[PDB]
Amino acid sequence: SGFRKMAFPSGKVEGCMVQVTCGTTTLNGLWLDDVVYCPRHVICTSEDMLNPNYEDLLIRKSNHNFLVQAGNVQLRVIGHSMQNCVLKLKVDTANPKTPKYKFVRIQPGQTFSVLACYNGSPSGVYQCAMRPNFTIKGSFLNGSCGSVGFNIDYDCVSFCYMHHMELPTGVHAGTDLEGNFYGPFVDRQTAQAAGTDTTITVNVLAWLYAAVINGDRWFLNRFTTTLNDFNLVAMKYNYEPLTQDHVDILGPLSAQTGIAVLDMCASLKELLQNGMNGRTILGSALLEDEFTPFDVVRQCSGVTFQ
Amino acid sequence: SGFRKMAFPSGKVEGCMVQVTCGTTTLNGLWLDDVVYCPRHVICTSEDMLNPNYEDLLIRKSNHNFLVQAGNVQLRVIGHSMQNCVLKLKVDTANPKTPKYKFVRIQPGQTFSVLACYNGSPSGVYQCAMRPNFTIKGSFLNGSCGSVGFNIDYDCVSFCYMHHMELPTGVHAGTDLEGNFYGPFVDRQTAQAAGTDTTITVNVLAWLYAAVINGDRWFLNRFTTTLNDFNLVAMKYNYEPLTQDHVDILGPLSAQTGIAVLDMCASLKELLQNGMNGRTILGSALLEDEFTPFDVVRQCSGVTFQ
Ligand SMILES: O=C(Cc1cncc2ccccc12)N(CCC1CCCCC1)Cc1cccs1
Ligand SMILES: O=C(Cc1cncc2ccccc12)N(CCC1CCCCC1)Cc1cccs1
Ligand SMILES: [Cl-]
């Protein structure tokens, strides 16, 4: 029992964190095999950041302009190339701690763990989700660039995020490990704004199923709804549209608890209308949207507390 | 910017997790130097748990009755002894991944990271607090016994908790690493209940300072209070008493934000008496009490642990 915002154990990623320095700029790098991945803005001064020409800035660097430190050991950079917004530094040593890994680009609503780092050293681990507006509500200070997001399903680390910047609202923007930004963001200091954020409806429903699995049913009601009527109501509360894919994905949780997906949708419509009336759901007075259907199944028991 | 429930990086602890099997019972063990620590109830069957005589049950066990698996390697048990509610299995091999460590017993209100494990394999990491009623609101399933709680203070892991059981309300009970339970709990399948819990006042104040540091200031007011008047009000809402030690500990945060601790206490008094009025603080509609003053300073200043 219990339901916590749970991150993956970070050890496999900690053994990959290195410090990357180019001139006066220092940030984090991810050392996998003989390559160190880091944000390409490591080659910029604060004066270059408005309209950097990364191809022009990079062509002026030699391998010895990049200082990579792994613990107290300096790695030798023997090559460098840019892939989208990521800089790839080839090093003369393969990381002996390289776990089984893959690079995956995720979709909004997906969750992942972030290993926040400064100067190539891990500071903390937390769980977050790719918001519908493609930002993440992280906890990052200056120097955190290059910190990564990942999932560790079945011993393989799937790296899905690399931190590049903080937007004016205090939210964060980054790329996948191939350097493609999530959302309409660019690695320039030009005025950029996160679009209006919405609640991840499928994740709130998943979390309501987690509440039923853990014994709570106060929020259920005798009603059902069509998928279209649910979306018409949901959009009024800035909730993301629930698609048939989302309904299908909630199938296993629906079968386990005995609550049809559209019946749980009716409960959600009522919660949006009434609030919680001094009650909590899994220790929260807000509807939680950073647990996916997959997270709930992984964390919760396969036996519902009837 | 941003403020997340952040756990310590778990890698140093992951390299210590092993699987301990005694008969049909399998749980987790912590392998440090040449000793594997685990709950003493690993020697019990469900029937033994009703009223166990651990000394009598342990007498019947040989070293070979304990199967310890570290990854895919079986460790050889060369001795066994009990210390309070922890079983200590002496093994023939010192753990080469043993970090610098210490065993510390924490006080209620103190936070720590839990590395939830199953079959000696880490599954997740989350941050929690030792409640004033000595329970932890964890997320644990059957097989999670032996999972540990820890903090990192510089490069030293301080192990403070070992998981033993779940109470009927879904909350958890365990011991320090010397086998002494936190709370009035015993390791026996008998009627036990968590006492009435209270809110960790110093931690709520620390989190209000974190909200201020993050630009959430709507709850600030022109008022101050005395420590005595605040404690009279706090006692009415089942909040823990705020001591002069707590006020001293909040000194740095008070100096950084310009809000005296009793000035923040007057904000908290108003929040208890009036609620949040539809507003949130750091994305929460409840007053969060699982961040200590040290956690807030650490997260807001980017302290690392390589
Ligand atoms: O937002 C950041 C870093 C950052 C990240 N997370 C959190 C942050 C919090 C506060 C300040 C900064 C943060 N940029 C990088 C700043 C460096 C640029 C090169 C020289 C040295 C500073 C700005 C841009 C990146 C891409 C496009 S604009
Ligand atoms: O509570 C647990 C483990 C546990 C922990 N966390 C979470 C749990 C969730 C569900 C069930 C169990 C959990 N005990 C152990 C159950 C037996 C398993 C087989 C061998 C003998 C013990 C019951 C105890 C009573 C008094 C002290 S322990
Ligand atoms: Cl995805």
SS3 A298: helix
CB B63 within 8 A of CB B74: no
Question: What is the distance between the alpha carbons of residues A2 and B124, in angstroms, rounded to a whole number?
Answer: 13
Q: Is A79 on the interface with B (CB under 8 A)?
A: no
Nearest ligand for residue A108 CA: 3
Sequence-distant (≥ 6) Cβ neighbours of residue B158 within 8 angstroms: B101, B102, B103, B104, B150, B151, B152
Shared domain check, A203 and A123? no
Q: Which atom in ligand 1 lies closest to the alpha carbon of residue A48?
A: 19
Contacts of B6 (CB under 8 A, 6+ apart): A116, A124, A125, A126, A139, B127, B295, B299
Task: Name the nearest CA neighbour of B271 among B210, B198, B215, B201.
Answer: B201
Give dist(CA B19, CA B27) in Å, integer: 6
Centre of ligand 3 from the C-alpha of residue A87, in Å: 24
Q: Is residue A306 part of a domain?
A: no
In 10 A of CB A27, how many CB atoms?
24
Residue carrying the six token digits 């048990």: B77
A100 touches chain B (CB under 8 A): no
Q: Are A112 and A157 in contact (CB under 8 A)?
A: no
A283 plus A216 within the same structural domain: yes
Angstrom distance (rounded) from CA B136 to CA B127: 10
Provide the phi-psi class of A44: left if phi over 0, else alpha when psi is between -120 and 50, else beta.
beta
Contact A10 B5 (CB under 8 A): no
Contact A149, A159 (CB under 8 A): yes
Q: How many whole angstroms separate alpha carbon B211 and alpha carbon B204? A: 10
- B137 Cα distance to chain centroid: 9
DSSP state of A70: E
Q: Which of A27, A41, A48 to mutate to test the pocket of ligand 1 (most atoms within 8 A of CB)?
A: A41
Task: Enumerate residues 228 to 287 of chain B having a beta carbon within 8 A of any beta carbon in chain A.
Answer: 280, 283-286
- Are A231 and A189 in contact by the 8 Å Cβ rule? The answer is no
Which residues of chain A make contact with B286, given a CB cutoff of 8 A? Answer: 280, 283-285
Mark which of A135, A164, A197 sits at the end of a domain: A197
Is-contact B41 B161, C-beta < 8 A? Answer: no
- Residue B151 included in any domain: yes
Q: Is A77 helix (H, G, I), strand (E, B) or coil?
A: strand
> Helix A227-236 vs helix A261-274: angle between axes, to the nearest 10 degrees?
30
Comparing alpha-carbon positions, the chain A residue that sits nearest to B169 is A1
A49, A69, A99 - which closes a domain = A99
C-alpha–C-alpha distance, residues B233 and B255, integer Å: 25
Question: Of all protein residues, whose CA lies closest to atom 25 belonging to ligand 2?
Answer: B189
- Indicate yes or no: CB of A3 within 8 angstroms of CB of B139: yes
**Is-contact B293 B301, C-beta < 8 A?**
no
Backbone angles phi, psi at A40, to 5 degrees: -65, -20
Counting ligand 1 atoms within 8 A of each CB, the residue from A45, A86, A117, A145 with the most, and so the one to mutate, is A145
Q: Cα–Cα distance between B162 and B31 in angstroms, integer?
A: 13
The answer to the question of residue B306 being in a domain is no
Active site residues of A: 41, 145
**Does B139 reach chain A within 8 Å, measured CB to CB?**
yes
Q: How many Å apart are CA A269 and CA A259, to the nearest integer?
A: 15
d(Cα A40, Cα B51) in Å, to the nearest integer? 63
Last residue of a domain, one of A197, A217, A251: A197
Identity of the residue in B2, B124, B171 whose CB atom sits nearest the CB atom of A139: B2
Give the total number of structural domains in chain A.
3
- Listed in sequence order, the residues at least 6 apart from B33 whose beta carbon sits closer than 8 Å to its beta carbon are B94, B95, B98
SS (H, E, C) B234-266: HHHCCECCCCHHHHHHCHHHHHHHCCCHHHHHH
Q: Ligand 1: does its nearest atom lie under 6 Å from the Cβ of A97?
A: no
Q: Report yes or no: A283 and A240 within 8 Å, Cβ to Cβ.
A: no
A61/A147 same-domain check: no
Pair of tokens at residue A105: 């680009």
**Rounded CA separation B60/A270 (Å):** 59
Tell me: do A210 and A257 sit in the same domain. Answer: yes
Instruction: Please compute Rg for chain B using Cα positions.
Output: 21
Q: What is the domain-level CATH number for residue A175? A: 2.40.10.10
Strands A148-153 and A156-166: antiparallel
| A187 CB near ligand 1 (under 6 Å) | yes
- % helix, strand, coil for chain A, step of 5: 25, 30, 45
The helix-helix angle for B261-274 and B227-236 (nearest 10°) equals 30
Active-site option among B128, B145, B160, B265: B145
Q: Which ligand approaches the C-alpha of residue A176 most closely?
A: 3
- Tell me which residue of B283, B292, B219, B218 sits closest to B252, measured CA to CA: B292
Q: How far is CA B10 from the centre of its chain?
A: 14
Give strand pairing partners of A91. Answer: A77
Residue B107's nearest CA partner among B151, B47, B41, B140 is B151
- Specify the DSSP class assigned to residue A5: -
Q: Which of residues 5-34 of B touch A (CB under 8 A)?
A: 5-12, 14-15
> Are A130 and A34 found together in one domain?
no
Q: B304 vs A137: CB contact, 8 Å cut-off?
A: no
Asked if B225 contacts B159 with a C-beta cutoff of 8 angstroms, the reply is no
Residue of A19, A125, A150 to mutate, interface with B, max B Cβ within 10 Å: A125
Q: Is B305 on the interface with A (CB under 8 A)?
A: yes
Nearest CA to ligand 2 atom 15: B165
- In angstroms, this model's resolution equals 1.7
CB distance A165 to ligand 1 below 6 Å: yes
Q: How many CB atoms lie within 10 A of CB B92?
A: 11
Same domain, B149 and B219: no
Residues paired with B90 in a beta bridge: B35, B79
CA distance A135 to A120: 23
- The most distant pair of C-alpha atoms in chain A lies apart, rounded to whole Å, by 68
Same-domain status, B90 and B122 = no
Query: Looking up tokens 């930002």, which residue turns up?
Result: A135
Q: What tokens were used for B305?
A: 């642990």
Question: For ligand 1, is residue A51 a contact (CB within 6 Å)?
Answer: no
Please enumerate in sequence order all residues whose Cβ is within 8 A of that of A259, keeping only pairs 6 or more positions apart, or say none: A209, A212, A220, A267
Give the E-state strand segments of chain A in sequence order.
17-22, 25-32, 35-39, 66-70, 73-75, 77-83, 86-91, 101-103, 111-118, 121-129, 148-153, 156-166, 172-175
Rounded alpha-carbon distances, angstroms, from residue A86 to A122, B76, B161, B287:
20, 47, 41, 40
User: Which residues lie below 8 Å from residue A170, measured CB to CB, with a gap of 6+?
Assistant: B1, B2, B214, B215
Q: How far apart are CA A45 and CA A22, in angstroms?
A: 9
Same domain membership, residue A261 and residue A129: no
How many helices and strands, by DSSP H and E, does chain A display? 8, 13
Cα(A142)–Cα(A137) distance, integer angstroms: 15
Tokens of B64: 């070979």
Query: Is the C-beta atom of A46 inside 6 A of ligand 1?
Result: yes
Q: What is the CATH number of the domain that holds A241?
A: 1.10.1840.10
Q: Is A188 found in the same domain as A123? A: yes
Same domain, B227 and B275: yes
DSSP code string of B82-98: EETTEEEEEESS--TT-
Q: Are B139 and A2 in contact (CB under 8 A)?
A: yes
- Interchain proximity B2–A119, CB inside 8 Å: no
Q: How far is CA B30 from CA A98, B143, B156, in A?
A: 24, 14, 16
Answer whether B15 sits within 8 Å of A14, measured CB to CB: no
Cα–Cα dist B13/B167, whole Å:
26
Indicate whether B4 belongs to any domain: yes
Q: What is the DSSP string of chain B?
A: ------BPP-HHHHTTEEEEEETTEEEEEEEETTEEEEEGGGG--TTGGGS--HHHHHHT--GGGEEEEETTEEEPEEEEEEETTEEEEEESS--TT--EEEE----TT-EEEEEEEETTEEEEEEEEE--TTS-B-----TT-TT-EEEEEETTEEEEEEEEEEE-TTS-EEEE-TTSPBSSS--SSSS---PPPP-B-HHHHHHHHHHHHHTT--TT--S----HHHHHHHHHHTTBPPPPHHHHHHTHHHHHHHT--HHHHHHHHHHHHHH--TT--BTTBSS---S--HHHHHHHHHT----
Tokens for B301? 């200043």
Give yes or no: residues A37 and A105 share one domain: no
Contacts of B267 (CB under 8 A, 6+ apart): B208, B219, B220, B221, B223, B259
Any idea which ligand is nearest the CA of B140? 2
Q: Domain range spanning residue A47?
A: 15-99
Judge whether B178 lies within some domain. yes
Residue A75 lies in a domain: yes
- B41 in active site: yes
Shared-domain flag, residues B162 and B66: no
Amino acid at A90: K
Identify whether the C-beta of residue A39 lies closer than 8 Å to the C-beta of residue A88.
Answer: no
Which mutation among A164, A171, A187 tests ligand 1's pocket best, with the greatest number of atoms within 8 A of CB?
A: A164
Q: Report the distance separating Cα A41 and Cα A47, nearest Å.
A: 12
**Chain A nearest-CA residue for B302:** A123
State the DSSP code for A7.
B
Nearest to A204 by CA among A171, A238, A170: A238
The answer to whether B210 and B3 are in contact (CB under 8 A) is yes
| Residue A66 structure tokens | 């990049």
User: Would you state the structure tokens that stand for residue A39, as one six-digit string?
Assistant: 């944000």
Tell me the one-letter amino acid at A32.
L
Residues contacting A6, CB < 8 A, separation 6+? A127, A295, A299, B116, B124, B125, B126, B139
